[PDB]
Structure formats: structure tokens, C-alpha cells
Design an enzyme around this catalytic site. Structure first.
Site, PDB file in Angstrom:
ATOM      1  N   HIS A  47     -55.758 -69.520   4.559  1.00 44.54           N
ATOM      2  CA  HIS A  47     -55.962 -68.306   3.782  1.00 44.54           C
ATOM      3  C   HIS A  47     -55.448 -67.055   4.501  1.00 44.54           C
ATOM      4  O   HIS A  47     -55.415 -65.985   3.899  1.00 44.54           O
ATOM      5  CB  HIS A  47     -57.400 -68.179   3.303  1.00 44.54           C
ATOM      6  CG  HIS A  47     -58.433 -67.877   4.319  1.00 44.54           C
ATOM      7  ND1 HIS A  47     -58.497 -66.741   5.105  1.00 44.54           N
ATOM      8  CD2 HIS A  47     -59.554 -68.561   4.550  1.00 44.54           C
ATOM      9  CE1 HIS A  47     -59.608 -66.800   5.831  1.00 44.54           C
ATOM     10  NE2 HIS A  47     -60.260 -67.902   5.510  1.00 44.54           N
ATOM     11  N   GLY A  83     -63.574 -61.384  10.802  1.00 41.77           N
ATOM     12  CA  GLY A  83     -62.630 -61.637  11.873  1.00 41.77           C
ATOM     13  C   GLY A  83     -62.886 -62.974  12.566  1.00 41.77           C
ATOM     14  O   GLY A  83     -62.110 -63.352  13.441  1.00 41.77           O
ATOM     15  N   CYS A  94     -63.028 -66.027  11.114  1.00 45.02           N
ATOM     16  CA  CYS A  94     -62.327 -67.190  10.584  1.00 45.02           C
ATOM     17  C   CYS A  94     -61.372 -67.766  11.618  1.00 45.02           C
ATOM     18  O   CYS A  94     -60.820 -67.030  12.415  1.00 45.02           O
ATOM     19  CB  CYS A  94     -61.561 -66.866   9.321  1.00 45.02           C
ATOM     20  SG  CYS A  94     -62.660 -66.213   8.040  1.00 45.02           S
TER      21      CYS A  94
END
Ligand SMILES: COc1ccc(NC(C)=O)cc1
Ligand SMILES: [Cl-]
Ligand code: NA
EC number: 3.4.19.12
Lengths: 301, 301
Positions: free
Chosen positions: A41, A143, A145
Site C-alpha cells: 500500500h 508511520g 506500517c
């Protein structure tokens, strides 16, 4: 003695964490050999949040659209592919700190360490369990991920989780390192909600065995139960079914303590009915379900 | 979001851990620059531990009496001295993995990460508070002596703890890295007890703020109180006195949430009086006191 939620030493994972930027989006990636793994993503923009067509978004990307940074060093991307919901950036340098590692997909109830990371820099380490509803109860801010979960049995790092998203109830969802989601979730911002969570019965039992190992006996009783009667009661408190597998798995703790598994089940049935009456077990006033049978033995005498 | 007890990433410390052997005792050491630090009680036989004369036992020792192993490499000990209850083994090689570090002494109520180690090998990492009674509630088995506790500030490791012993109640006691005990304890096999412990008030309050920030808000109320009134309740429940310094330190969290400290104290008062028999805040049915204001801010920002 003592008994604590204990994470694995994180150093071997720390030397693998990098920052990945694509567009205005920065998150973490995992640098192993000459590949950086990160959530796919990262390649989404604002209007790619609901129904991204990842195959179409990725074909439009060149290697130079991905900025990868290991501390100060910029790593140069020389290739990209997608595997399920993980992006694999091929880089020109193999990570010299790559540990012995493997990728494993875990089952509900299993525990692992999470190395929370921001901008490629590790922030903290803590233990989680894969919940029966395929979420984890983590601590993740914007932040985070690309942060990963792992075990380290015998010097080899087994990666089992990569963080993708936070669901509305404040719980966390992610994939294995092959990019397959745990649970029915998708990497889209369409409305999604976790199933009703249940307690991990086998783990609660293992923790009661820990308590007895550590010299607590107050919650034991002179009763036993059939497995079936146990399940009929425990399910009324949203406990997971205990299977014969679970019974087999507790056999070693049963043996070390001299308390048969179904006797321990009887104690749990009573704790569910009575609560703790102002007492605590291993420093908790709740029944803890994020220690596996294997974690108990690892940590205990 | 989410709130979890979280250790510092342990890699900078893992690179410093060695095994130290003197006679039949093996335990852990900390290798920084060209010195290895470990508990002085390593030089004691069981007979000696009852009433040790360390001055005497040490002069009787030589460099070759100490075997120091970093991974699979013997270090040569070229000197030995004692500082308070820590032994300092000078070796012929500076640790190439020495981080930016200092030795610090922490105050009761402050937290730190413990890297539990066995045979020089890091085994697990968890967060501890230095209790008001100068113990820690750790998880340690035989062989864990010499494991260390630390904080990380930017890239500087502040070492604050070295593990020395378990007390009869299952709690843990150790020294700073200059060999000074936390608490009224001695490094000898004698009768020793932890003082009655108290609850760290400012940390409980910090954790109630964490709870609010994570949408746990049920325990709040319209009321407020004074330091004096609250402190009279605290004394009654074996809570530490709340000082003006504590109120100031919680200022950020008071701001963030709109709940002033004495506002939160009113909440805490009711919780001490009225209770939470089985009900929960951030997944706990106890009032948790091992998170500092800094811990809450750092994790939640
Ligand atoms: C094997 O001999 C010993 C000597 C000393 C200790 N511990 C302390 C705190 O004096 C333990 C075992
Ligand atoms: Cl598994
Ligand atoms: Na209030």
C-alpha cells in the site's frame, strides 16, 4: 522466578529495518539479503485508498520512484515485484547484517515479538498473540506500517507478521511475510471490522500452570471436568473451544506440576464463575491468554 | 493507537554480553571498551557466600582464574579489580561493538529495559520499574546474574542495573554499574527481605492518561481535589505521596486530555475507595504503576 511478558532480543531484526518512501508516503521495510519487503500500500495515493488496482499502480512505477534508506545510506532499487500484499524491492546491496531467518505463518494463539519502528528506526519491542479473530492488540502509530513480528528460537529469526493497518476498534491487522493477510482483511480503506474476539483457552491454562510452577496454589480445587462439560461452560464466557490437541500440548506442564489438564480446567471453570476475590495471579487481576505452553516452559524452571 | 509495555530495542546491549566463569560459577558480564563488568559474587564458592570476605577472596585470585567468553572467542583477562559489589575484568581487546554509553543510577519509580541473559547469551527483554522498596519484579532463573538494565536516549545507552539476586518473595535485587546496591541489600547468602512496597502514584496517573488517550474514559468524573486531601487517601492505600513535581511532570498529559491532575486524582481516589472488582482499564483489572509519564508520552506521540 517471576513471570513477565518477555520479548525476544531485537538486535537481529533491528539490523534489517529500513525506510521506504514512494510518493508522499514513508513507512518501514525489512531488508533481508538483497530484498526489501514492505506493504504494497506504500504505492497508493489519496484516490487509491478505497479500490486500489495494485497491478496497475505498480506497472507505472520505475525503480527510482522508490527511495530506500538504511540509516544514511541510500539503497538503490534495481527491480520490483509484488507477492500477494507484500512489495519486494530488489536492491543492489545485500544486507551484511542479514541473520539466519525463515518466513512462517502462525495460527491464532501463537505469540511473537513486535519491533515497532518509525522512519526505519526501531522504537520498542513487545509481545503480542495472534488473536482468534486474526487481529493483534498492538501499539502502532502513524508511520509504523512495515513493522514486523518475529520469534527467535535457536538463533534463527522466524518472521511471521508485517503490520499493514489499524481497524476501527483500535486493533491491528497484517500479513505474513508472503503477503497473505491473517484473517479476512484486505489492504483497502473500505469499511472492515474484526470478528468478536474470544479468549485463548489453552494459553490461559498454560499460564495457570506457570502460576503453580511459581508457587501459587490458591485457585486449585478438588474437582475435575470432562472436556465436553468444560467447553460448554467456557464458551459461555467467550472462551475458545479447548481441543484434544490443546490437552496433548499441556501434557508436559501437567507432568511437571502433577496437576492433570482436566483438573486445571476445573480450576479455570471456577475462576470464571468466581473471579479472583481481590487476589492476583502472577501479578494480574485478569486471566492472561497471551502466553503459550511453549512460552511458559521457555521462561520457567 | 494501542498501549503496551514496551522495552527498548536491545541490539546495542546484546553486542556487549559475554559469559564469565570463575571456578564452578558461570554468569553474565557486560563488555564495554576493554573491561568486563559482572557481580563480584562470581568469585564465591557456596561456603564463601554465607559470610564472604571479598577483599581476601579477591587478592587470592589471579587473571587466569577468570574465563571470559564472547560468543566463541576467549578474551584474555589482563587485570582485575573490584568496585563496590561489581568485579571489573580488564581484557586485552576493546569491544568493537561498544555503543555510546554511560553509567547512570535511576530513582525509584523510573523504568528501564532488562536484557535477561544466560551463559552470555541474550534470552529476552522486558520493562521493569525500580520499586519504591528498591526491588524490581523481574523474571530471572539461575544463570541470569549479570544481566543488565538500561535506557536508550537518542543513540546513548544509559546502563542503570546489574542483576545480583532473588529475594525470598520472588522479587529481584541488584546494583548500578558502579556496584552500589539499589535498596538495603547485601551480596551474601543471609536472611534478607524486601520492605513493604508502595504504589507509584505518578505512574498510575500517567497510565490513566494513557487510558484516556486510547478512549478508555469511564472512570473519569466532574470532580477535583487537592494534593493534601488526595495524599491522605494515598497514605491510607500505601500509595507514594504525590508532589508538585509529579503534577508538573504530568502537565503534557493534562494538556492533551483536558483532565487536570487533581481532576485525575479525584478519579483515582474513587478507584481506591470504590474499586474495580474485575472491571478493566487498558486491559487490566489492576491499577498499573510501572509506566512513567515519559513512557506514556513517548509511546503515545
Ligand atoms: C555458588 O556460590 C554462590 C555465591 C554467591 C551467591 N549470591 C550472592 C548474592 O552472594 C550465589 C551462589
Ligand atoms: Cl503457529
Ligand atoms: Na475529575
Amino acid at each position: 522466578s517471576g513471570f513477565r511478558k518477555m520479548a525476544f532480543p531485537s538486535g537481529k531484526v533491528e539490523g534489517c529495518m529500513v525506510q521506504v518512501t514512494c510518493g508522499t508516503t514513508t513507512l518501514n521495510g525489512l531488508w533481508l539479503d538483497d530484498v526489501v519487503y514492505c506493504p504494497r500500500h506504500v504505492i497508493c495515493t489519496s484516490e487509491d485508498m478505497l479500490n486500489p488496482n495494485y497491478e496497475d499502480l505498480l506497472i507505472r512505477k520505475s525503480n527510482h520512484n522508490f527511495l530506500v534508506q538504511a540509516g544514511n545510506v541510500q539503497l538503490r532499487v534495481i527491480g520490483h515485484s509484488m507477492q500477494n500484499c507484500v512489495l519486494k524491492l530488489k536492491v543492489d546491496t545485500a544486507n551484511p547484517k542479514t541473520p539466519k531467518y525463515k518466513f512462517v505463518r502462525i495460527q491464532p494463539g501463537q505469540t511473537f515479538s513486535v519491533l515497532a519502528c518509525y522512519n526505519g528506526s526501531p522504537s520498542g519491542v513487545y509481545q503480542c498473540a495472534m488473536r482468534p479473530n486474526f487481529t493483534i492488540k498492538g501499539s502502532f502509530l502513524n508511520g509504523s506500517c512495515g513493522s514486523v513480528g518475529f520469534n527467535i528460537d535457536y538463533d534463527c529469526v522466524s518472521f511471521c507478521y508485517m503490520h499493514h493497518m489499524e481497524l476501527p476498534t483500535g486493533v491491528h491487522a497484517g500479513t505474513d511475510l508472503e503477503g497473505n493477510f491473517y484473517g479476512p482483511f484486505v489492504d483497502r480503506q473500505t469499511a472492515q471490522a474484526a470478528g468478536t474476539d474470544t479468549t485463548i483457552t489453552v494459553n490461559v491454562l498454560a499460564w495457570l500452570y506457570a502460576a503453580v510452577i511459581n508457587g501459587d496454589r490458591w485457585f486449585l480445587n478438588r474437582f475435575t471436568t470432562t472436556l465436553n462439560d468444560f467447553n460448554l461452560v467456557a464458551m459461555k464466557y467467550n472462551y475458545e473451544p479447548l481441543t484434544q490437541d490443546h490437552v496433548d500440548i499441556l501434557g508436559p506442564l501437567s507432568a511437571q506440576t502433577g496437576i492433570a489438564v482436566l483438573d486445571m480446567c476445573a480450576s479455570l471453570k471456577e475462576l470464571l464463575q468466581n473471579g479472583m476475590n481481590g487476589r492476583t495471579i502472577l501479578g494480574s487481576a485478569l486471566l492472561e491468554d497471551e502466553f503459550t505452553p511453549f512460552d511458559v516452559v521457555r521462561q520457567c524452571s
